[PDB]
Design an enzyme around this catalytic site. Structure first.
Site: not given
Ligand SMILES: O=C(/C=C/C1CCN(CCc2ccccc2)CC1)NO
Ligand SMILES: [K+]
Ligand SMILES: [Zn+2]
Ligand SMILES: [K+]
Length: 640
Positions: A176, A307, A137
């Site tokens: 993601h 996770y 990201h």
């Molecule tokens: O693993 C990844 C990143 C993964 C992140 C992406 C963003 N959310 C947070 C979004 C959120 C969660 C709960 C409440 C409000 C907003 C968590 C996980 N990328 O490969």
């Molecule tokens: K991906």
């Molecule tokens: Zn991810």
């Protein structure tokens, strides 16, 4: 040739964590690294990998992909207290900082470069870096989604700069969208980026219009960005495999990368609270395996997300098992991708048809608490590949291959000879002893995996090979036959599926045979690859055989692709394949043994795009078979 697999890991990257409450970031924990490394140790896989130390990415390396301003601001966070680290974190979306995160970020980036150097210096064949924080990201001037620096982008930029690479594939199977990678390389045709991801019509984070299938790159890089949005949660093994057979693999083998880097997030695995998909950990053993014949096996797997501490450990192990060459698990229950997946697949294919050969026929209408079973044990065979060359012919064999005949089995050949054959050619009768001896070692023992036997009489050899397999009993047998003529194979009880690669156009009636007649010529190589990825593999996986039987008759043209197929087809039947080569041909026999034994496959390179006659032939086979074998589908079906 390079051997071994690197594992880059360091306990220091688990030494930063969230210091305030924030349910957005609550899930990115140090234990993901701990659990993943300790699962590799528990399964004996760490001990089999060359440990390679971590290092810090230097300032110059960081600046390959990030701006001075951003690096300067991150460089200040080790001196910040908690109040200040929160204020700094709030400038970015879904990211937290910690007094040690800058340090760990340089480690996660240096580890990726350590991996890239070990693979490009041929010190290992491939490897995996378990790192934290993740990268994909990260953007040129911003942290985003738990990522500080873009580890995988570094790796491709660094490999470009330091090894003069022209073609790099990045495969991002995290759940993601790795928009940082895409932004990095969107105008760069030297880096091909593939990402699948939970999109849900842009309602899932990071909610980006350009995460959709229509972002194909920009400028000279148009066609080297491929987004496959998942517009529903719950995607299964069949969806993931359908994406690979009908989108990723056709594009990747035409691109012919000199290096493959995997953004390996395992939040796309069953049980993950972020991804909410349903693919089993075992699918990552095949995702890895299907990519390994690319770039002579030079594959750098870099951890991103994941996770569910349990599905996390099992997918990391499945990945390293495959990097180490261990036999693949059988995937059961495959069929058609769901309608949402076929929609995304068909839309990517259509928009990409401007750019890739394997899709070009589409452009002209003339041509157009969660619980699941713990994965079974994967153990390398003591002797991987048995070889039976013609009598007297000794060959230089790889360190995990042997030459082949008990009296117990010599009795069986008499029994068969007396009933079904009469036959007295005492050489053929040695062939039959060999087949039975190899087959018994393949199925009875977990210390021989596959094997090749040279034979003279095809029909009697095929018959006993098949009949001995069907009585062990091997529930199902996939038969792959390169040649003309009818073989004594009765493929109409459901237990046998016959792939036949021939030279005479023969109408086949029923849906347990796939017959491919590819017009001879220079385009023969690309056409074969297109049928392998788009037809043979999708059917074989749904079929799920317990043994694969390869058959080549003495009547060369095959030598350019036989190794890719032998390698890819070992995704089936836990690698249990028996190849009958009719006649002696030291080069075909050397190649077969090499792929059977797990060696590197030499690249295909640039191939003349396939003949349109062949592509009409293969879409006619897909039309004819996709109703029985749903995994063949790469469009949504007509609703009556
Ligand atoms: O693993 C990844 C990143 C993964 C992140 C992406 C963003 N959310 C947070 C979004 C959120 C969660 C709960 C409440 C409000 C907003 C968590 C996980 N990328 O490969
Ligand atoms: K991906
Ligand atoms: Zn991810
Ligand atoms: K690109």
């Amino acid at each position: 040739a390079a051997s071994g697999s690197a594992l880059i890991f360091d306990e220091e990257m688990s030494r930063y964590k969230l210091l305030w409450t924030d349910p957005e970031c609550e899930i990115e924990v140090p234990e993901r690294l701990t659990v993943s490394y300790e699962a590799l140790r528990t399964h004996g896989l760490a001990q089999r990998c060359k440990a390679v130390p971590v290092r810090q990415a230097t300032e110059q390396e960081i600046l390959l992909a990030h701006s001075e301003e951003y690096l300067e601001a991150v460089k200040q966070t080790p001196g910040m207290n908690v109040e200040e680290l929160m204020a700094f974190s709030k400038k970015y979306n879904a990211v937290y900082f910690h007094q040690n995160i800058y340090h760990c970020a340089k480690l996660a980036a240096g580890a990726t470069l350590q991996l890239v150097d070990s693979v490009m210096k041929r010190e290992v064949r491939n490897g995996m870096a378990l790192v934290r924080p993740p990268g994909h990201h990260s953007q040129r001037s911003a942290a985003n989604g738990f990522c500080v620096f873009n580890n995988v982008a570094f790796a491709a930029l660094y490999a470009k700069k330091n090894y003069n690479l022209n073609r790099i594939l990045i495969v991002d199977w995290d759940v993601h969208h790795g928009q940082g990678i895409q932004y990095c390389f969107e105008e760069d045709p030297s880096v091909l980026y593939f990402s699948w991801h939970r999109y849900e019509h842009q309602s899932f984070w990071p909610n980006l219009p350009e995460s959709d299938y229509s972002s194909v790159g920009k400028g000279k890089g148009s066609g080297f960005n491929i987004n496959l949005p998942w517009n529903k949660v719950g995607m299964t093994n069949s969806d993931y495999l359908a994406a690979f057979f009908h989108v990723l693999l056709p594009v990747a083998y035409e691109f012919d990368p000199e290096l493959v880097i995997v953004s390996a997030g395992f939040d796309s695995a069953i049980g993950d609270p972020e991804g909410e998909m349903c693919a089993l950990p075992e699918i990552f053993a095949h995702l890895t395996h299907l990519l390994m014949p690319l770039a002579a096996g030079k594959m750098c797997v870099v951890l991103e997300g994941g996770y569910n501490l349990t599905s996390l450990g099992q997918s990391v192990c499945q990945t390293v098992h495959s990097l180490l060459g261990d036999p693949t698990p059988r995937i059961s229950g495959l069929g058609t991708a769901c309608d949402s997946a076929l929609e995304s697949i068909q839309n990517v294919r259509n928009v990409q048809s401007s750019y890739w050969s394997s899709f070009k026929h589409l452009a002209q209408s003339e041509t157009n608490d969660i619980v699941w079973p713990e994965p079974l044990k994967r153990m390398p065979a003591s002797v991987r590949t048995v070889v039976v060359p013609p009598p007297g012919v000794e060959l230089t064999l790889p360190k995990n291959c042997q030459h082949s005949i008990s009296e117990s089995t010599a009795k069986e050949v008499q029994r068969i000879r007396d009933k079904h054959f009469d036959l007295t050619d005492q050489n053929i009768l040695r062939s039959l002893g060999n087949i039975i001896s190899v087959l018994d070692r393949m199925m009875r023992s977990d210390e021989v995996c596959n094997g090749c036997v040279v034979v003279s009489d095809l029909s009697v050899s095929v018959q006993c090979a098949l009949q001995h397999a069907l009585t062990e009993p091997a529930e199902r047998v996939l038969v792959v036959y390169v040649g003309d003529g009818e073989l004594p194979v009765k493929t109409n009880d459901g237990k046998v599926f016959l792939v036949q690669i021939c030279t005479k156009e023969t109408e086949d009636k029923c849906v347990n045979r796939l017959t491919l007649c590819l017009r001879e010529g220079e385009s023969l190589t690309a056409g074969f690859m297109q049928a392998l990825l788009g037809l043979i593999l999708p059917v074989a996986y749904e079929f799920n055989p317990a043994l694969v039987l390869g058959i080549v008759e003495e009547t060369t043209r095959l030598m350019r692709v036989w190794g890719h197929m032998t390698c890819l087809i070992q995704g089936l039947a836990r690698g249990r394949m028996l190849t009958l080569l009719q006649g002696y041909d030291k080069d075909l026999l050397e190649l077969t043994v090499s792929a059977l034994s797990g060696a590197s496959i030499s690249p295909l390179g640039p191939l003349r795009a396939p003949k349109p006659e062949d592509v009409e032939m293969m879409e006619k086979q897909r039309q004819r078979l996709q109703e029985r074998w749903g995994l063949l589908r790469c469009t949504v079906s007509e609703s009556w």
